[PDB]
Design a protein around this nucleic acid. Structure first.
Ligand code: CIJ
Ligand code: CIJ
Ligand code: MG
Ligand code: MG
Ligand code: MG
Ligand code: MG
Ligand code: ZN
Ligand code: ZN
Lengths: 368, 184, 368, 184
DNA sequence: TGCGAAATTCCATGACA
DNA sequence: ATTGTCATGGAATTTCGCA
DNA sequence: TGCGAAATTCCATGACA
DNA sequence: ATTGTCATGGAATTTCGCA
């Protein structure tokens, strides 16, 4: 306030005010003649109010706020004060977009064996076909082998019915699913404990985490669409055809079909491969074990030039899941409790519970 | 001549009538010849139609070069023959009254009848629900002749449901008392 | 057929069949012992059928189809035949995705003067506020100066009412809009002819083309959302506040506000700039003319490594606009009549009319 | 002392009662002092409320440092004073019975009354629709004193609606005959 | 020990709504 | 308490057939 | 004729649903 | 018959204040 600006008018040096300019009084206000022109130097006790009125005109960020202020005022380290306010504007923090990208994706290891890990998910609603609307898709992690079930709803009860049929063949160690209602119910949890099956869940609102099955949904819809061209969308009777068609399709990067990775030999389908015709089953299973372990595995891609990775103790904000019209896209700031891996964290909610969350659904809070 | 393989030959047969369970009366039994792997499907009748429906499920997972059966009516119909031909599956019949499969298959089918009967008694009406667990049991059962279970031979890995209690399969005195009474 | 495969069995050379392998007969079929194993060589008259059965199993692309065929057969230049079929599978051509990106965006020149070109558009439906649901947004191309009007519908009639008020101030040479119902009606076309105003339309289904106004919609919704935090969404009374707030906000890259680019001097709003206080109006307008011409203009960015640009005579397919569930995402192939610029073309529809279309809504037909 | 600029001073006034047009009876007239640019707003009454509503539109486009008016009741009310104070607009009044604006403004207002009257006759009820075209006319009218139109001075460019027919503004013998009859 | 062509591998693009 | 994926078809690169 | 810090400019990111 | 845009806040770079 007055203390500082006093010493100044009488030509003494204050840290921050460059000596080479001259600082007069006029109209009851301290002033300075700067290269851009004459600016008022407000008392420090007045600065936060000024920064705040400038910011509030349109809730502008750093430069656009500064440019308003600079029209009338000058003082030492203006942006420091502007930034101080930006970091406290609740409305800016929760409405503005991020401008930092997520760090590069992980490529989790292929499950070592068939039945080690199932990914499951629903497709639909589809046009009604024999009273059916959805498809449960079950993809074996290691092999890509896929089972399809038509259902009337994405319910626990229809999940359970379908998996009782599937698990006739074998019981998986793990079932990975997203947080759909069908999979997170306590009835489904009991169904899995009853069987020794561990339930693994995707972080919420992050379908990429079920990428294995999501990607197979693509191929399913794509082949259905082709088979249905110029016919009514009667998909129910094509599920079995599509299932077998896909399980016996080569992946060009692997050079094997999912059927082959599961059984190590083709059944009586068209164009069956015959290379192991002179091997005993035991020799064939032995070649299969070799093939299973040496499959191509992709690596983590390069980070984009402006990505961020989470650090324990960081303020970060969780994306609002289904934000109403004209409502903020971000929750209030929260703290990283634990970095589970560079793409997955535990935060202290906003509710405030522990929440395990994908970094894709987080932004780092701006201005610290 | 080339070694035996999974999907070379499926052996099929019906078991039943059984007491009704959730509407069903029969079990279509399919056993892979090389591995001894078993699949079971509940049906309402031993008809061509019910066989076709059930085999349509199995043959959307894997197709055998040959189906072997007895001369049951469901299997000798011209419909079932058309079905098989459409899928490039050769049909194979034992001669009437002389049912012959293979040692491994015969034994497997015998295991199936005995395991069914054991779990029937006490709850002769609740078998529909148990078919999955039966199958797991059967397919994770050690083969004296080969050093491996059907599961192991089919998929070339250990199973997450080993059945280390290779079991009685025999009826206790109480269970014969239950089954000589149910049949009264 | 037989002609070719005859000469072969008797050790004579046929172009395409390498001499160093030996070609026997067996089971009524010509065969060859290749490094991967023994393959049947079908008669040429049989090959298209084979390629087609392999392809049809799952409607696979080049490699995944080839890998099926190679299980049983070998012949000269298999992929040539596979590709020939892929280029004729209607179902594949119209269902598959593209894997070529659009060429880099154009940055059209800033309109030279205020009122040279308006971009207009609707935002909404928004939560009801005093019976209003939409906002007409009018952005002046040169300046970014923006007018906001609350409406009850995105109708021609409310467009006309709003623009009769706006054009009180000045009449624009051009109004650019997208193809919304409100702007493409014959009533709206008459309204513009009556006034000497040329109507320019975006290519269909390409909001980027109205980027000028779309981008301002973002800022409008963003400031409304901030102003409405923790209050009911009563936006009607804030339109005027938001309008003035944005028209007087600096763009950091330009260093001017839209108000400034339009008038060359600030009105009595907070933090008004005072640099031209000692200039006459005429001097000030003269400085404004200078500032208007020297504004930063962005350039066309680098092409991505696998983009395509349209060539006259090319087969290309138009994106299906609102494709039903399990229906193809692409129309049947069509021909580029005219390359209007590297991002805009005229094609021979599918209906088959002339249609002016963005390259972002096209893929080049695969396999020629 | 510094040169005159747009938004330095807005001169406001009411014209009316007029014959009702789409419900409206008055025109609030605003003229920028430096440029002579005119804005017109139809109102139902010469009230503070109607002035505030109309000026709320204009002042969401541009805010004057000073509003000048006569001592009309709408402009001297404590509400209108509160409104102006909230926006940092200084209010300025001519003395009662002595209305003084500026040469440029006086002439402009005179143009406005005469242009209105000219287009009234024949269609005294259709003025609401014509207010836009009136404004364009006025704002693209050459200034004898300055070498420029209000449009040119406000935006510093030529307009796309030049009004090269700098017009009569005078009533033909037929139109006086129409207006001496309408007033009967 | 090297050439032209074919075969294979690479890999950006885009959809899992 | 968890984590992207992989068919696709031009282009880049390697291998093949022959000398 | 050069240093540390402040000021300015650069520019990838993401939303216009 | 047409065509992306630009606020944002860290980082990179330039300028300032002083010697
Ligand atoms: O948006 C959803 C979604 C929401 C809720 C669900 O239960 C669910 O299964 C899905 C789902 O499949 N997708 C599509 C999608 C979008 C982007 C992606 F990267 C991937 Cl992989 C998938
Ligand atoms: O999807 C639409 C759309 C459809 C129809 C309209 O009339 C319309 O105004 C819009 C619209 O604004 N957006 C949002 C959007 C999406 C992506 C982009 F790049 C840009 Cl710029 C804008
Ligand atoms: Mg899901
Ligand atoms: Mg999904
Ligand atoms: Mg629109
Ligand atoms: Mg839009
Ligand atoms: Zn703010
Ligand atoms: Zn196809």
């Amino acid at each position: 306030l007055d203390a500082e600006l006093d010493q100044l008018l009488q030509g003494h040096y204050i840290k921050g005010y460059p000596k080479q300019y001259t600082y007069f009084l006029e109209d009851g206000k301290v002033k300075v003649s700067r290269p851009e022109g004459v600016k008022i130097i407000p008392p420090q006790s007045d600065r936060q109010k000024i920064v705040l009125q400038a910011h509030n005109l349109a809730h502008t960020g750093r430069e656009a706020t500064l440019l308003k202020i600079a029209n009338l005022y000058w003082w030492p380290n203006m942006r420091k004060d502007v930034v101080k306010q930006l970091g406290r504007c609740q409305q800016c923090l929760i409405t503005n977009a991020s401008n930092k990208a997520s760090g590069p994706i992980l490529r989790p290891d292929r499950p070592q064996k068939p039945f080690d890990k199932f990914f499951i998910d629903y497709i639909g609603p589809l046009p009604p076909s024999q009273g059916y609307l959805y498809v449960l898709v079950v993809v074996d992690g290691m092999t890509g082998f896929t089972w399809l079930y038509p259902t009337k709803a994405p319910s626990t009860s229809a999940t359970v019915k379908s998996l009782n049929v599937l698990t006739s063949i074998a019981i998986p160690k793990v079932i990975h699913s997203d947080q759909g209602a069908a999979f997170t119910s306590s009835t489904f949890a009991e169904w899995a404990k009853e069987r020794g099956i561990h339930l693994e869940f995707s972080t919420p609102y992050h379908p990429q985490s079920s990428g294995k099955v999501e990607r197979k949904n693509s191929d399913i819809k794509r082949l259905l669409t082709k088979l249905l061209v110029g016919r009514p969308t009667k998909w129910y009777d094509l599920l079995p055809v599509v299932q077998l068609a896909l399980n016996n399709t080569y992946s060009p990067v692997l050079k094997y079909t999912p059927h082959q990775l599961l059984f190590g030999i083709d059944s009586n389908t068209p164009f069956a491969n015959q290379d192991t015709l002179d091997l005993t089953r035991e020799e064939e299973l032995s070649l299969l074990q070799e093939i299973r372990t040496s499959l191509y595995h992709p690596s983590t891609p390069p980070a984009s030039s402006r990505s961020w990775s989470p650090v324990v103790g960081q303020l970060v904000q969780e994306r609002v899941a289904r934000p109403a019209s004209l409502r903020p896209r971000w929750h209030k700031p929260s703290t990283v409790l634990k970095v589970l891996n560079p793409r997955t964290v535990v935060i202290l909610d906003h509710l405030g519970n522990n929440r395990t969350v994908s970094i894709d659904n987080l932004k780092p809070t701006s201005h610290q | 001549d080339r070694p035996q393989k999974p999907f070379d030959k499926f052996f099929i047969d019906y078991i039943g009538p059984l007491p009704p369970s959730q509407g069903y009366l029969y079990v279509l039994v399919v056993v892979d010849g090389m591995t001894g792997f078993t699949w079971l499907y509940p049906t309402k009748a031993p008809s061509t139609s019910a066989t076709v429906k059930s085999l349509n499920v199995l043959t959307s997972i894997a197709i055998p070069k040959v189906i072997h059966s007895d001369q049951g009516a469901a299997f000798t119909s011209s419909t079932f023959a058309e079905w098989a031909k459409e899928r490039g599956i050769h049909l194979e019949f034992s001669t009437p009254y002389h049912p012959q499969s293979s040692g491994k298959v015969e034994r497997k089918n015998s295991d199936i009848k005995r395991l069914l009967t054991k779990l029937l008694v006490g709850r002769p009406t609740k078998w529909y629900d148990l078919l999955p667990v039966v199958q797991l049991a059967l397919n994770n059962t050690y083969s004296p002749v080969l050093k491996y279970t059907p599961h192991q031979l089919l998929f070339g890995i250990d199973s997450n449901t080993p059945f280390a209690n290779q079991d009685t399969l025999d009826l206790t005195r109480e269970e014969e008392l239950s089954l000589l009474q149910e049949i009264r």
